[PDB]
């Protein structure tokens, strides 16, 4: 197991735009398009990361591809910042792909407002860290993925997803 595969799991993937969990226009593996409540600007919005007219349909080799980006993307965001940076440095490298699905999920800054639970992480407080997790929307709207991630830092171990 790495990353990519524990993403391809909570994301799942499919190739026509469709509506997150938030209800936002999505695609591929997880790839948000943009908040806004229009097809249509969700349509341009995926010609343009896509490069061509694809009338809301994309190839799997495509999907693969904004995907990619989008991991590399989550990496580069928790090493840029100040908050995420030192913890992420102090984590194993299974603990390390958990932080990263939270900031794929949630964005950088979103989970830099986890100020006490990447604490509890740095000091590697597992149990607590966990419990600590649990109590965020977060945790209440995806409960069943939320789970997965929390697991993975209380063990360091993939258990929740094999
Ligand atoms: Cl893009
Ligand atoms: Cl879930």
Same mark, same amino acid.
């Given at each position: 197991?790495?990353?990519?595969?524990?993403?391809?799991?909570?994301?799942? $993937?499919?190739?026509? *735009?469709?509506?997150? @969990?938030? #209800?936002?226009? /999505?695609?591929?593996?997880?790839?948000? %398009?943009?908040?806004?409540?229009?097809?249509?600007?969700?349509?341009?919005? $995926?010609?343009?990361? *896509?490069?061509?007219? @694809?009338? #809301?349909?994309? /190839?799997?080799?495509?999907?693969?591809? %904004?995907?990619?980006?989008?991991?590399?993307?989550?990496?580069?965001?928790? $090493?840029?910042?100040?908050?995420?940076?030192?913890?992420?440095?102090?984590?194993?490298?299974?603990?390390?792909?958990? %932080?990263?699905?939270?900031?794929?999920?949630?964005?950088?800054?979103?989970?830099?407002?986890?100020?006490?639970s990447?604490?509890?992480?740095?000091?590697?407080?597992?149990?607590?860290?966990?419990?600590?997790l649990?109590?965020?929307?977060?945790?209440?709207?995806?409960?069943?993925?939320?789970?997965?991630?929390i697991?993975?830092?209380?063990?360091?171990?993939?258990?929740?997803?094999?």
């Amino acid at each position: 197991m790495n990353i990519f595969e524990m993403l391809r799991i909570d994301e799942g $993937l499919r190739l026509k *735009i469709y509506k997150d @969990t938030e #209800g936002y226009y /999505t695609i591929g593996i997880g790839h948000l %398009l943009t908040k806004s409540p229009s097809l249509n600007a969700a349509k341009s919005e $995926l010609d343009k990361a *896509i490069g061509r007219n @694809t009338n #809301g349909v994309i /190839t799997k080799d495509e999907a693969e591809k %904004l995907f990619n980006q989008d991991v590399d993307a989550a990496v580069r965001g928790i $090493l840029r910042n100040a908050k995420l940076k030192p913890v992420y440095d102090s984590l194993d490298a299974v603990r390390r792909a958990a %932080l990263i699905n939270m900031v794929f999920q949630m964005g950088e800054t979103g989970v830099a407002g986890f100020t006490n639970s990447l604490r509890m992480l740095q000091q590697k407080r597992w149990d607590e860290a966990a419990v600590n997790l649990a109590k965020s929307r977060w945790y209440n709207q995806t409960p069943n993925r939320a789970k997965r991630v929390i697991t993975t830092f209380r063990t360091g171990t993939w258990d929740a997803y094999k």
